[PDB]
Design a protein around this nucleic acid. Structure first.
Ligand code: CA
Ligand code: CA
Ligand code: CL
Length: 238
DNA sequence: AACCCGGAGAC
DNA sequence: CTCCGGGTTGT
């Protein structure tokens, strides 16, 4: 694994911007929201996930399309350590509905954003006692507990891309034009409790093709507009 | 299995 | 806010 110096990241970010719009290789294309991230990784020579460390060594690398209305940033994924499993939560709270991409395919889905301070429409909420005890409740009923390790996101390099071409098409292209270094991470108990940090469940199942469920892992996420509540220091790199 | 890479529109 | 995907890695 290469450990990128801060200066090497800055230099590389300028080189990347200077390349203009980058294309999706034919063999990479898979009708995939995440392709912006795959393209950005390739530019940093990131060849596989590393279990211990952020992608760049000291920093975790994240790419995002610069949408006017911007989806949350996914920080990382983690299964609950105790209580109900994600498949058990899916069994109970999932709902049957056509695929949003392909209306002719019937799915069972649980795509839900769960947060502290409020019950969502499915009755789900979070509370945290410590960072290693984040609990999922359905109403006043305890379900599960997460023990989250924040180590990999202590420092981020977040890079925004402009796009041309249809979203998730083979012709989609990406110009990385802005980037930020985020550091001095805050304790997350209050951020969970106050609904700044959220947890998305992203499980579905292709019933039409008689397939098993696909649990994409509980996603810890945060709106881009609230990054200043998670990190005390945000520095423009590009 | 349990992580990885990320999205949309309504009001 | 409700609601939404594509993968590989580890057993
Ligand atoms: Ca990674
Ligand atoms: Ca990354
Ligand atoms: Cl689980």
């Amino acid at each position: 694994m290469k450990i990128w110096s801060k200066e090497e990241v800055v230099n590389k970010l300028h080189e990347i911007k200077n390349k203009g719009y980058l294309s999706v290789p034919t063999d990479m294309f898979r009708t995939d929201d995440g392709v912006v991230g795959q393209i950005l990784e390739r530019q940093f020579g990131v060849q596989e996930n590393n279990i211990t460390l952020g992608d760049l060594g000291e920093f975790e690398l994240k790419g995002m399309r610069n949408r006017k209305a911007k989806s949350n940033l996914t920080l990382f994924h983690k299964k609950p350590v105790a209580g109900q499993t994600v498949i058990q939560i899916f069994n109970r709270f999932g709902y049957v509905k056509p695929s949003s991409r392909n209306p002719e395919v019937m799915k069972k889905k649980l795509f839900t954003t769960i947060k502290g301070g409020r019950l969502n429409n499915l009755g789900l909420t979070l509370n945290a006692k410590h960072a290693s005890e984040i609990n999922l409740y359905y109403q006043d009923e305890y379900l599960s507990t997460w023990d989250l390790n924040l180590s990999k996101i202590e420092k981020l390099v977040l890079v925004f891309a402009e796009t041309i071409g249809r979203a998730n098409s083979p012709e989609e292209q990406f110009h990385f034009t802005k980037a930020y270094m985020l550091t001095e991470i805050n304790d997350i108990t209050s951020l969970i409790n106050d609904g700044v940090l959220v947890m998305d469940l992203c499980i579905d199942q292709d019933l039409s093709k008689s397939k098993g469920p696909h649990d994409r892992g509980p996603h810890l996420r945060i709106p881009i507009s609230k990054l200043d509540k998670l990190y005390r220091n945000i520095e423009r790199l590009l």
